[PDB]
């Protein structure tokens, strides 16, 4: 029942793939945790996620949607200075910042079925630009929607723009959301922009 130790990292930065927490993820099971957002925003149900991650018995990190093939005709190389690593701009190891390709952000859809015989932890983000000019520059559309639906989760996001105080050199925010996918359940993502797509997910038992 050895504890999982994150060191200088919080549970938020470790689960999202903060470029400053690359040396971690050493165990498949633990009884408690000993312990962080590179792009500012709100983390919904965060302390509930810490409860469910407090003790696991079969932890595993897998590629939920590969960097290629998953999101064709969209740009997937998005990095920012807020998530700097070794002086080079980077981004979360488990999320993809989908942006337009060739001036177009077409309507997007992709799905995953849980066939790993355990609970799957899927995390994603929703980007809120600080002015409408950059909203259309990144995602082409003016009114954006992000649809995440499973057999036990369903929510649509209508991101709107506001000018917010400067934090970490940034004035826009990214809200982070998550859900647990039961065995045999399916999750579908639908968006025309403002989606920080899941890149790596986690499969686990107990919680």
């Amino acid at each position, epitope marked *: 029942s050895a504890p999982l130790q994150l060191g200088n990292c919080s549970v938020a930065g470790w689960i999202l793939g903060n470029p400053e927490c690359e040396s971690l993820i050493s165990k498949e099971s633990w009884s408690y945790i000993v312990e962080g957002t590179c792009y500012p925003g709100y983390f919904a149900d965060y302390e509930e996620l810490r409860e469910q991650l407090s003790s696991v018995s079969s932890f595993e990190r897998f590629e939920i949607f590969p960097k290629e093939s998953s999101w064709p005709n969209h*740009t997937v*190389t*998005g*990095v*920012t*200075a807020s998530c700097s690593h070794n002086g080079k*701009s980077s981004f979360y190891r488990n999320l993809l*910042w989908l*942006t*337009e390709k*060739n*001036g*177009l*952000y077409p309507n997007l859809s992709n799905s995953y079925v849980n066939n790993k015989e355990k609970e799957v932890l899927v995390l994603w983000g929703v*980007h*809120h*630009p*600080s*002015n409408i*000019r*950059d909203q*259309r*520059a*990144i995602y*082409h559309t003016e009114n954006a929607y992000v649809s995440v639906v499973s057999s036990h989760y369903s929510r649509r996001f209508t991101p709107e723009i506001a000018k917010r105080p400067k934090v970490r*050199g*940034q*004035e*826009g925010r990214i809200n982070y959301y998550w859900t647990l996918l039961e065995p045999g359940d399916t999750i579908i993502f639908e968006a025309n922009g403002n989606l920080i797509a899941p890149w790596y997910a986690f499969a686990l038992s107990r919680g």
Partner: antibody
Amino acid sequence: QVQLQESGPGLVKPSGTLSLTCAVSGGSISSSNWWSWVRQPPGKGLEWIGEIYHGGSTNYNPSLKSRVTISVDKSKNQFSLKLSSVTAADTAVYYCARAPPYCTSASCPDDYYYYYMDVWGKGTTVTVSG
Amino acid sequence: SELTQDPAVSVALGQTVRITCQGDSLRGYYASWYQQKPGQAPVLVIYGKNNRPSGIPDRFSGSSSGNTASLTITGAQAEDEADYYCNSRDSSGNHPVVFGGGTKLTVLG
């Protein structure tokens, strides 16, 4: 993938209006791109004229704003340039180019803070003479 | 603001030349470079931070330091004799685009 065809008259009378048209192929004019215009007088350097976003918003050179009008026609996938009150100083070679989208705030990926013009038209020579 | 560059510079065949472009509009957005030969249209050679379009040899490299962007040509050749313009968008106001004065590059030898 995207190319630009240029059109217009090669001779404009003094005090008249210059009129050029750029045709977009392999892409929609209604995409997140800044369709620009550049001119180059004989023997001088490049001079930026202005740009237009497919929504209708425009941005012009402060020294030429009084006489420049850039439009967009989504019906024919074209964008044009109009310069009124032309003199010998407006005799130049004119180009239509494409510029990427950009951001004014920090809430964007790094690749949206570049400025370049990768796709160019072949160039139309315009002469101001009677 | 405005971009200023030296009107002419020369380099021997097989050596290295550094075309410098200075302006206050360089810290905001990333600068781009163009090569223009006589009677022809400009072709983009450098954009962003040392990113070359497909078709530009690795001899062309770009860098930036403060209010100064530079274009470096390693192992210059006779085919590199042309005019070189820096280009960037200003970070204030309506964000107008400004071209440098251009630098006529002569390849000696």
